[PDB]
Enzyme design. Structure first.
Site, PDB file in Angstrom:
ATOM      1  N   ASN A  44       0.826  -1.200   0.000  1.00  0.00           N
ATOM      2  CA  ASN A  44       0.000   0.000   0.000  1.00  0.00           C
ATOM      3  C   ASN A  44       0.861   1.251   0.000  1.00  0.00           C
ATOM      4  O   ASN A  44       1.771   1.380   0.821  1.00  0.00           O
ATOM      5  CB  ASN A  44      -0.999   0.108   1.183  1.00  0.00           C
ATOM      6  N   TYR A  84      -8.739  12.238  -2.524  1.00  0.00           N
ATOM      7  CA  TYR A  84      -8.831  11.386  -1.343  1.00  0.00           C
ATOM      8  C   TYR A  84      -8.844  12.269  -0.078  1.00  0.00           C
ATOM      9  O   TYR A  84      -8.182  13.308  -0.036  1.00  0.00           O
ATOM     10  CB  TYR A  84      -7.588  10.534  -1.275  1.00  0.00           C
ATOM     11  N   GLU A  93     -13.487   7.622   5.224  1.00  0.00           N
ATOM     12  CA  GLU A  93     -12.408   7.696   4.225  1.00  0.00           C
ATOM     13  C   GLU A  93     -13.111   7.817   2.902  1.00  0.00           C
ATOM     14  O   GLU A  93     -14.083   7.145   2.665  1.00  0.00           O
ATOM     15  CB  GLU A  93     -11.595   6.412   4.248  1.00  0.00           C
ATOM     16  N   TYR A  95     -13.088   8.875  -1.530  1.00  0.00           N
ATOM     17  CA  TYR A  95     -12.400   8.880  -2.840  1.00  0.00           C
ATOM     18  C   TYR A  95     -13.275   9.472  -3.915  1.00  0.00           C
ATOM     19  O   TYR A  95     -14.437   9.148  -4.027  1.00  0.00           O
ATOM     20  CB  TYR A  95     -12.143   7.433  -3.294  1.00  0.00           C
ATOM     21  N   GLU A 183      -2.478   6.638  -5.551  1.00  0.00           N
ATOM     22  CA  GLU A 183      -2.449   5.429  -4.705  1.00  0.00           C
ATOM     23  C   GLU A 183      -2.014   4.184  -5.536  1.00  0.00           C
ATOM     24  O   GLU A 183      -2.491   3.954  -6.630  1.00  0.00           O
ATOM     25  CB  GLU A 183      -3.821   5.127  -4.137  1.00  0.00           C
TER      26      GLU A 183
END
Ligand SMILES: [Ca+2]
Ligand SMILES: [Ca+2]
Length: 320
Positions: A44, A84, A93, A95, A183
């Site tokens: 990640n 993000y 969270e 996006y 990401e």
């Protein structure tokens, strides 16, 4: 370059390099909101530049948020190019994904869609159970707007997505962050975010967002993003609620060449003036003191003097 976890401010923008264990990454910070990035064989990784907030305000309180960006984006594997960030209380969270690598996120059944910024985004909600977070391990909701096809530049109307989520019952907390982000998951790649302006806080209507009419009206990308009106009867129009009876209109446009181009203005079917563009270089032509009266009214921009020697290019119309 930055090659391990780091949070800071650079040229007005809050930046962050974040990864977990495994592989490597490198992030170079450039002027304003820009940066470039490289990664290989990660689990990640997240690279971003935006704004972090003090966790006391809703998005309404902070104001309108809009990101204007462009990136060169070459993922090899699973990756996103996305706005993000997080809210807190409740912990969310989120996006707004414009492009990706091998896999289009996030899986599951869409809750809805939004047509904005010239594209279409499907909206998703998922629970994340016992996952890492800005507040440690936690259970939290994850909200997504995901474009139905890829794009790597343009304008993201962040506040508009926030409102669509809320209108579907996807409740938001106080803001912690909003950032243009690259990401990677189980992947390698590179990206150069060469433009990233986050804007927080006269109406401008983009030609390319209006309704097209006539035989040939079409979208263009040079000398700006907008439309071309080629022939008599080509037009663009939209409805607008006027609250006062008297306005100024400013059209940014150009001719396709060195011959003068003309675009007529109408409001509620009535002729109100003409905009002139003397050559191929973009300019703003302003018609002042137009009495039109109040309420919803059709605004049109239409060619009526074409003779096969010029076309009119239109970028946007401003009403004051
Ligand atoms: Ca023409
Ligand atoms: Ca435009």
């Amino acid at each position: 370059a930055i090659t391990s976890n780091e949070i800071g401010t650079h040229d007005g923008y809050d930046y962050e390099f974040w990864k977990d264990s495994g592989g490597s990454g490198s992030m170079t910070l450039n002027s304003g909101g820009t940066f470039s990035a490289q990664w290989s064989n990660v689990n990640n990784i997240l690279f971003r530049k935006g704004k972090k907030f003090d966790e006391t305000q809703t998005h309404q309180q902070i104001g309108n948020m809009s990101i204007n960006y462009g990136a060169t984006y070459n993922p090899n594997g699973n990756s996103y190019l996305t706005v993000y960030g997080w809210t807190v209380d409740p912990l969310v969270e989120f996006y707004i994904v414009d492009s990706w690598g091998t896999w289009r996120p996030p899986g599951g059944t869409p809750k809805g869609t939004i047509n904005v910024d010239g594209g279409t985004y499907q909206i998703y909600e998922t629970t994340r159970y016992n996952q890492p977070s800005i507040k440690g391990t936690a259970t939290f909701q994850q909200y997504w707007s995901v474009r139905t096809s890829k794009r790597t530049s343009g304008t993201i109307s962040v506040s508009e997505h926030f409102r669509a989520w809320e209108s579907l019952g996807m409740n938001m907390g106080n803001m912690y962050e909003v950032a243009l982000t690259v990401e990677g998951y189980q992947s390698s790649g590179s990206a150069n975010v060469y433009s990233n302006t986050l804007t927080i806080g006269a109406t401008r209507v983009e030609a390319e967002s209006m309704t097209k009419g006539g035989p040939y009206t079409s979208n263009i990308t040079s000398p700006f993003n907008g439309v071309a009106l080629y022939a008599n009867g080509d037009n663009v129009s939209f409805n607008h609620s006027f609250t006062k009876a008297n306005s100024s209109f400013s059209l940014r446009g150009a001719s396709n060449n060195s011959n003068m181009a003309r675009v007529d203005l109408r409001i509620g079917g009535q002729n109100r003036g003409t905009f002139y563009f003397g050559d191929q270089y973009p300019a703003v032509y302003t018609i002042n003191n137009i009495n039109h009266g109040i309420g919803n009214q059709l605004v049109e921009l239409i060619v009526t003097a074409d003779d096969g020697t010029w076309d009119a290019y239109l970028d946007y119309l401003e009403i004051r």
